[PDB]
């Protein structure tokens, strides 16, 4: 004889179907993350890492590193050809 109780029965009722499914996905995606640009890790110098933080950086990454690599390759090849040819 008791009336229905919508706001009293919300323990099992969630927000539709998709919103409750994505609530767990969105609650923790924003929890454990850097606030703003933390840990840049820019500093690196290990020849390969020296190239990474010197010319191979993605801020520009223009053809200048490629031209420098080609210049070094042809400089080595000149001596190689002198040895061979």
């Amino acid at each position: 004889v008791s009336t229905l109780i919508p706001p009293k029965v919300v323990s099992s009722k969630n927000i539709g179907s998709a919103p409750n499914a994505k609530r767990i996905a969105n609650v923790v995606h924003f929890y454990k993350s850097l606030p703003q640009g933390p840990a840049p890790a820019i500093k690196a110098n290990t020849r390969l890492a020296r190239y990474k933080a010197k010319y191979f950086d993605g801020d520009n990454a223009s053809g200048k590193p490629l031209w420098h690599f080609a210049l070094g390759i042809i400089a080595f090849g000149y001596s190689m050809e002198y040895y061979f040819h």
Binding site: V1, S2, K8
Partner: protein
Amino acid sequence: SVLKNTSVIDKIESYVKQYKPVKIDASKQLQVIESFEKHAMTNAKETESLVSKELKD
């Protein structure tokens, strides 16, 4: 005063005099209504707490 040869006004007067206590009033809404209400506030506070923490989340 309207009736002269009544012969019945005393009988009806006595009948109403003996009829006013018809029976004891029930006033016993305290066996299933009380249990329904107890469950009502219990799980209602539970739902209030859960919706509150969901809002904070």
